[PDB]
Enzyme design. Structure first.
Site, PDB file in Angstrom:
ATOM      1  N   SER A  34       0.880  -1.196   0.000  1.00 45.47           N
ATOM      2  CA  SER A  34       0.000   0.000   0.000  1.00 45.47           C
ATOM      3  C   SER A  34       0.902   1.227   0.000  1.00 45.47           C
ATOM      4  CB  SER A  34      -0.933  -0.021   1.153  1.00 45.47           C
ATOM      5  OG  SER A  34      -1.854   1.053   1.061  1.00 45.47           O
ATOM      6  N   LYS A  58      -0.579  -1.066  -4.561  1.00 44.36           N
ATOM      7  CA  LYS A  58      -1.855  -0.346  -4.397  1.00 44.36           C
ATOM      8  C   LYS A  58      -1.546   1.139  -4.300  1.00 44.36           C
ATOM      9  CE  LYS A  58      -4.306  -0.156  -0.512  1.00 44.36           C
ATOM     10  NZ  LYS A  58      -4.505   1.308  -0.422  1.00 44.36           N
ATOM     11  N   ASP A  89      -6.743   2.260  -5.557  1.00 47.88           N
ATOM     12  CA  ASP A  89      -7.716   2.101  -4.454  1.00 47.88           C
ATOM     13  C   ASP A  89      -8.700   3.278  -4.501  1.00 47.88           C
ATOM     14  OD1 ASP A  89      -8.966   1.460  -2.056  1.00 47.88           O
ATOM     15  OD2 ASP A  89      -7.127   1.649  -0.838  1.00 47.88           O
ATOM     16  N   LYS A  91     -12.078   3.226  -4.654  1.00 50.14           N
ATOM     17  CA  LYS A  91     -13.339   3.051  -3.887  1.00 50.14           C
ATOM     18  C   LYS A  91     -14.477   3.754  -4.628  1.00 50.14           C
ATOM     19  CE  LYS A  91     -10.720   4.507  -0.715  1.00 50.14           C
ATOM     20  NZ  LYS A  91      -9.406   3.846  -0.532  1.00 50.14           N
ATOM     21  N   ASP A  94     -20.752   5.055  -6.233  1.00 51.79           N
ATOM     22  CA  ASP A  94     -21.989   5.780  -6.598  1.00 51.79           C
ATOM     23  C   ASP A  94     -22.644   5.095  -7.774  1.00 51.79           C
ATOM     24  OD1 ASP A  94     -23.978   7.827  -6.587  1.00 51.79           O
ATOM     25  OD2 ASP A  94     -22.517   9.419  -6.484  1.00 51.79           O
ATOM     26  N   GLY A 227       0.506  -1.170   4.388  1.00 51.78           N
ATOM     27  CA  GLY A 227       0.992   0.202   4.226  1.00 51.78           C
ATOM     28  C   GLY A 227       2.040   0.518   5.260  1.00 51.78           C
TER      29      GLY A 227
HETATM   30  N1  LIG Z   1      -9.397   0.465   0.587  1.00 47.06           N
HETATM   31  C1  LIG Z   1      -8.704  -0.524   1.147  1.00 47.06           C
HETATM   32  S1  LIG Z   1      -7.885  -1.624   0.327  1.00 47.06           S
HETATM   33  C2  LIG Z   1      -8.882  -0.555   2.599  1.00 47.06           C
HETATM   34  C3  LIG Z   1     -10.033  -1.132   3.117  1.00 47.06           C
HETATM   35  C4  LIG Z   1     -10.054  -1.409   4.472  1.00 47.06           C
HETATM   36  O1  LIG Z   1     -11.007  -2.019   5.036  1.00 47.06           O
HETATM   37  N2  LIG Z   1      -9.009  -1.077   5.264  1.00 47.06           N
HETATM   38  C5  LIG Z   1      -7.916  -0.465   4.795  1.00 47.06           C
HETATM   39  O2  LIG Z   1      -6.975  -0.203   5.565  1.00 47.06           O
HETATM   40  N3  LIG Z   1      -7.811  -0.174   3.433  1.00 47.06           N
HETATM   41  C6  LIG Z   1      -6.648   0.558   2.879  1.00 47.06           C
HETATM   42  O3  LIG Z   1      -5.469  -0.235   3.079  1.00 47.06           O
HETATM   43  C7  LIG Z   1      -4.379   0.570   3.536  1.00 47.06           C
HETATM   44  C8  LIG Z   1      -3.989   0.179   4.949  1.00 47.06           C
HETATM   45  O4  LIG Z   1      -2.808   0.887   5.275  1.00 47.06           O
HETATM   46  P1  LIG Z   1      -2.034   0.617   6.643  1.00 47.06           P
HETATM   47  O5  LIG Z   1      -3.006   0.697   7.792  1.00 47.06           O
HETATM   48  O6  LIG Z   1      -1.393  -0.757   6.513  1.00 47.06           O
HETATM   49  O7  LIG Z   1      -1.009   1.721   6.656  1.00 47.06           O
HETATM   50  C9  LIG Z   1      -4.835   2.009   3.401  1.00 47.06           C
HETATM   51  O8  LIG Z   1      -4.407   2.572   2.140  1.00 47.06           O
HETATM   52  C10 LIG Z   1      -6.339   1.921   3.509  1.00 47.06           C
HETATM   53  O9  LIG Z   1      -6.898   2.997   2.780  1.00 47.06           O
HETATM   54  N1  LIG Z   2     -23.326  11.164  -4.397  1.00 47.38           N
HETATM   55  C1  LIG Z   2     -24.556  11.657  -4.520  1.00 47.38           C
HETATM   56  S1  LIG Z   2     -25.002  13.102  -4.004  1.00 47.38           S
HETATM   57  C2  LIG Z   2     -25.482  10.669  -5.076  1.00 47.38           C
HETATM   58  C3  LIG Z   2     -26.007   9.699  -4.232  1.00 47.38           C
HETATM   59  C4  LIG Z   2     -27.082   8.964  -4.696  1.00 47.38           C
HETATM   60  O1  LIG Z   2     -27.700   8.123  -3.983  1.00 47.38           O
HETATM   61  N2  LIG Z   2     -27.563   9.152  -5.946  1.00 47.38           N
HETATM   62  C5  LIG Z   2     -27.033  10.039  -6.796  1.00 47.38           C
HETATM   63  O2  LIG Z   2     -27.531  10.186  -7.926  1.00 47.38           O
HETATM   64  N3  LIG Z   2     -25.960  10.836  -6.391  1.00 47.38           N
HETATM   65  C6  LIG Z   2     -25.301  11.786  -7.317  1.00 47.38           C
HETATM   66  O3  LIG Z   2     -26.254  12.788  -7.702  1.00 47.38           O
HETATM   67  C7  LIG Z   2     -26.181  13.058  -9.104  1.00 47.38           C
HETATM   68  C8  LIG Z   2     -27.461  12.626  -9.793  1.00 47.38           C
HETATM   69  O4  LIG Z   2     -27.393  13.072 -11.134  1.00 47.38           O
HETATM   70  P1  LIG Z   2     -28.634  12.910 -12.123  1.00 47.38           P
HETATM   71  O5  LIG Z   2     -29.120  11.484 -12.087  1.00 47.38           O
HETATM   72  O6  LIG Z   2     -29.691  13.900 -11.655  1.00 47.38           O
HETATM   73  O7  LIG Z   2     -28.040  13.301 -13.452  1.00 47.38           O
HETATM   74  C9  LIG Z   2     -24.943  12.340  -9.604  1.00 47.38           C
HETATM   75  O8  LIG Z   2     -23.801  13.227  -9.619  1.00 47.38           O
HETATM   76  C10 LIG Z   2     -24.770  11.198  -8.631  1.00 47.38           C
HETATM   77  O9  LIG Z   2     -23.393  10.877  -8.565  1.00 47.38           O
END
Ligand SMILES: NC(=S)c1cc(=O)[nH]c(=O)n1[C@@H]1O[C@H](COP(=O)(O)O)[C@@H](O)[C@H]1O
Ligand SMILES: NC(=S)c1cc(=O)[nH]c(=O)n1[C@@H]1O[C@H](COP(=O)(O)O)[C@@H](O)[C@H]1O
Ligand code: PRO
Ligand code: PRO
Lengths: 256, 256
Positions: A34, A58, A89, A91, A94, A227
């Site tokens: 990481s 990552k 990573d 994530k 939406d 990480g």
């Molecule tokens: N997004 C994922 S892979 C993720 C999911 C999760 O449940 N826990 C996570 O620590 N991570 C990510 O893994 C890394 C852990 O770093 P460290 O605690 O070993 O320094 C970090 O980049 C974090 O965003």
């Molecule tokens: N991230 C949030 S605010 C979100 C959550 C959700 O449940 N549904 C969402 O459509 N959105 C966001 O609102 C916008 C809807 O766009 P439209 O379908 O009106 O064109 C879009 O940018 C989407 O990523």
């Protein structure tokens, strides 16, 4: 249970999963670094020195102070040289219409350089359908976040079961999970586990650690994501080798 | 039930929520434009023309092909001129240590220009604690995603209840929700609802639409978030005015 090399040949294996499993077996590594750093030079120096020790690097492209697409070109050169995959990573989390644009476009052009990305399953399967519209033509793979390592995680019970179903129903693009344990019984899926350190503890912001022996050996995961256990060490190469040897032996012992 | 102007004065109101509620009442708008565009020039031309009609402009900085911090300087000038808040829809969704860096750093420096950001609650409360370490010193606010508009959303039942508890326990930084309905009984919290169009339907990737009358009037939300219903129209100013008048009248009728 099959070796990583045999899993690489399974009929339903995704090509990205197959490439990964083959280089894991070849290099005797199930360690994902990481690379949570803010300088391109540090990212690239870690990738070059630790490349032989890792199956995967990552990235968090959005914390690089000096991101450019040229940095990612240089990272791809190192990934090809040392044989590891690049996992952004991101994530994605939406509706499908939004994540499709986030994956292809903007300044990062993530799909152009990332072998793997991940997604949260909370929006429902449209998150996968949107990403796959970009990722399938580009022969990419995706990991679904089925469990999280942090205190108060809501990725439990029916949420985890929904992530597994979504993966298994989108096997042309989804190649595995971020999870704390084996969550799918299907060997074509990879399990990658963050929240890993050799020593017990956590951080000040809800991170919790388990050992490589615990998560690979007892919990049945495939790959450790590490990480700070590496990055904060003085000798990051020695630290990476300690984590690699821990995760690899835990895998061998479980395989028997 | 209190007017937006009275809610702006509640004892426990967050300063960002207070600023927002005051300009909503002043301008008779509870419309948030979802500016889902790839060109800085289109983002800024929409912000200038629609600024008087909106309480808020929601950005996705990561889909702008030509993002620079200077674009965000120009957006702030328009936000101050026309009196609306900037909401970056970043969907922070990991451990506190990671999201802290993503909020402050990298190329986007989101905390430097975004009045509001949002977060998924799936990692547990560390996601809020990490963001607040950057956001509290900078007088920023955060919205928690308690419900989602898309088919198969897992943000239901106990997940939604956990989002509400996390918000109510972090009121110094969390100012409200992304939700489909009123989810908190506490009037200090804002409810912002995406998935809104005047006509029934959805998209090809799991988006589902409800009308402004339904989500403000019947479901008790405060603000509609509208993307394609405005952005895809020929006359985006007229479209924004139709959505503004719909959401505003639905609010007035519920208030009685
Ligand atoms: N997004 C994922 S892979 C993720 C999911 C999760 O449940 N826990 C996570 O620590 N991570 C990510 O893994 C890394 C852990 O770093 P460290 O605690 O070993 O320094 C970090 O980049 C974090 O965003
Ligand atoms: N991230 C949030 S605010 C979100 C959550 C959700 O449940 N549904 C969402 O459509 N959105 C966001 O609102 C916008 C809807 O766009 P439209 O379908 O009106 O064109 C879009 O940018 C989407 O990523
Ligand atoms: O020869 C190899 O490496 C692979 C591993 C399983 C069978 N064939
Ligand atoms: O005068 C105003 O606008 C505010 C609204 C509620 C009471 N004071």
């Amino acid at each position: 249970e099959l070796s990583f090399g045999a899993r690489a040949e399974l009929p339903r294996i995704h090509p990205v999963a197959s490439k990964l499993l083959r280089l894991m077996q070849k290099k005797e590594t199930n360690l994902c670094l990481s690379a949570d750093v803010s300088l391109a030079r540090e990212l690239l120096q870690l990738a070059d020195a630790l490349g032989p020790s890792i199956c995967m690097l990552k990235t968090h492209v959005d914390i690089l102070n000096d991101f450019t697409l040229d940095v990612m070109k240089e990272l791809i050169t190192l990934a090809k040289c040392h044989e590891f995959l690049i996992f952004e990573d991101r994530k994605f989390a939406d509706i499908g219409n939004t994540v499709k644009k986030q994956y292809e476009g903007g300044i990062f052009k993530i799909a152009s350089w990332a072998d793997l990305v991940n997604a949260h399953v909370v929006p429902g399967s449209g998150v996968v359908k949107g990403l796959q519209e970009v990722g399938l033509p580009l022969h990419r793979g995706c990991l679904l976040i089925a469990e999280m390592s942090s205190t108060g995680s809501l990725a439990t019970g029916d949420y985890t079961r929904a992530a597994v179903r979504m993966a298994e129903e989108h096997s042309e693009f989804v190649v595995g999970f971020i999870s704390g344990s084996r969550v799918s019984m299907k060997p074509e899926f990879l399990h990658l586990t963050p929240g890993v350190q050799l020593e017990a503890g956590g951080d000040n912001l809800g991170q919790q650690y388990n050992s490589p022996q615990e998560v690979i050996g007892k919990r049945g995961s495939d790959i450790i994501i590490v990480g700070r256990g590496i990055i904060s060490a003085a000798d990051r190469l020695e630290a990476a080798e300690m984590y690699r040897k821990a995760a690899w032996e835990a895998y061998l012992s479980r395989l028997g």
